[PDB]
Design a protein around this ligand. Sequence first.
Ligand SMILES: C[C@H]1CN(C(=O)Nc2cncc3ccccc23)Cc2ccccc2O1
Ligand SMILES: C[C@H]1CN(C(=O)Nc2cncc3ccccc23)Cc2ccccc2O1
Lengths: 303, 303
Amino acid sequence: SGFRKMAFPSGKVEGCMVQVTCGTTTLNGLWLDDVVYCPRHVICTSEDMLNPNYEDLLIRKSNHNFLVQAGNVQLRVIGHSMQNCVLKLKVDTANPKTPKYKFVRIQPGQTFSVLACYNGSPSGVYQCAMRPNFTIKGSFLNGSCGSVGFNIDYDCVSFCYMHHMELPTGVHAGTDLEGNFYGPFVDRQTAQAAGTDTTITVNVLAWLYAAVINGDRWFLNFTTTLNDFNLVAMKYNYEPLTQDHVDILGPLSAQTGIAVLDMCASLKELLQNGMNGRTILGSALLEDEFTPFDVVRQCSGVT
Amino acid sequence: SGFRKMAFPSGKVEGCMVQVTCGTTTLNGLWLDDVVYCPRHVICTSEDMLNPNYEDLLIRKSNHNFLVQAGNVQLRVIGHSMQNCVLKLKVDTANPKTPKYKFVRIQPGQTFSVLACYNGSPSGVYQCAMRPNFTIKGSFLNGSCGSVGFNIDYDCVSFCYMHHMELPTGVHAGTDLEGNFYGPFVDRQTAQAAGTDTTITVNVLAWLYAAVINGDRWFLNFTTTLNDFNLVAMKYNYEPLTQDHVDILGPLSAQTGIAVLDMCASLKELLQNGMNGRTILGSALLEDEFTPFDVVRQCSGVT
Ligand SMILES: C[C@H]1CN(C(=O)Nc2cncc3ccccc23)Cc2ccccc2O1
Ligand SMILES: C[C@H]1CN(C(=O)Nc2cncc3ccccc23)Cc2ccccc2O1
């Protein structure tokens, strides 16, 4: 038993991290097959990042201006093209360590693992959630640009995130692997407002089920309507709970023998009454970085 | 910026996880060079685990009674020997993916990453701390026995943990890679008391420095004696703060420009006054699973 914030095994993603150098700027890249994916603002200097014209800047760049290092190995760049906010550098060598992989774009609330890298070398791995306002509260330093987020679906790595930028708030923004930003953000150093962040309600409910499974049960009690609890959730800046959310919580409801609405009733008084100084699974706040599938992955131990 | 509980890259450890089967029992093992390390209670049935005589039980076992699977590959066992609580199975093949590695025994308070495995296949990775009473609050299911904890010191994997058992509390106990249990625990299913757990004080102080580095500073204020704050710590079941602990907090003190004693004064009122409903780095409790080296690893981004 026990419940921890668990990240996927990062082995298959480690073998795809490269070092990309252009001009003086250096950030991380993703080498799959004979293509290297990296953020496009590698072609920018510090004066460029205030308002870069990426088409005009890339036009001054040629294949030999791109230094792709794969460990001690250095790959020959034979092509380049800008797809949205990522650069796609075609190289002569295909990556021998390429896993079976897909490119996916997650929806808000979904979770993934981040392999934080610097100069193409891995440094750490952690689990996090795509906030409703399409940001992530990550751990990123200067040079972590190019690190990727991913999920693993039985020997298949689903890349969903490439880190681009830090917002002045201290939170982070990025794109999918096709270059399209999550949220209303642009790769440019100006004031950028992240929206009002809400709590992933379906995740908090899945996390309370994981606590019942693990023995902590004091928060159980009432029932409530979906409509009635949503009005409770709206006041506490929780994102509304739809019927599909109830449907996905079905297996947890059947294993626990607690109807979804009864759990929503127990959470509604958690919201209105605080926690009185107690803890759930060793946390004094309500955790929302576990999806209903995350909870049953860990409680079932899928590999 | 940002601060997350970060686990080491688990790639090098993934290539050493095997499946070990003996009788009907199956758990994980560690294949380094031509030796496979696993918990010795793999030779036990469910009636054996009440009070097993491991010498008498192992004497009935021969090399062919041991099924070591390395993925689809299955290795030939040509020797076996019991070192304390681990079994050492010599195999014909040397592991081609063996990293540069050491066997170390950590002291309490030190942290490491756990690669949770089932049937020799990795499932997740998380960061945790060896509690002062030599247990870990982990995430382990039936079959996770044999998973290892480790630190990585620049391309060198230092194995320090092998998970053996769940205590009736729901916490976990294990050994070093030489078979000696952390704590007063024996591989046998009886009532086993873990000692009074204390809070790793040197870790909480390193975590408050990481918050100052990351912008959250409201908890700063006074100074206090080492002796005077230790008496504050003793009442709140914090382990005493020695001078070496102050010495290790030096670099964080010089980067932050806050003397260690002033931080101890700020923590002492955190202990006496609670947190008033606020959060530090997004946590409503005082985190103690970050060592002073963990904090500067992440704030420096070592790879
Ligand atoms: C300069 C250009 C390129 N960017 C980065 O280098 N971003 C960073 C990514 N990760 C961690 C960081 C920590 C500290 C400073 C930047 C970090 C993204 C960016 C972030 C903030 C302001 C402007 C900006 O645009
Ligand atoms: C039976 C023998 C072998 N052991 C395990 O199989 N331990 C386990 C390790 N991890 C997760 C577990 C989750 C649920 C049940 C056991 C778990 C260790 C052990 C634990 C508890 C009681 C007795 C005992 O001794």
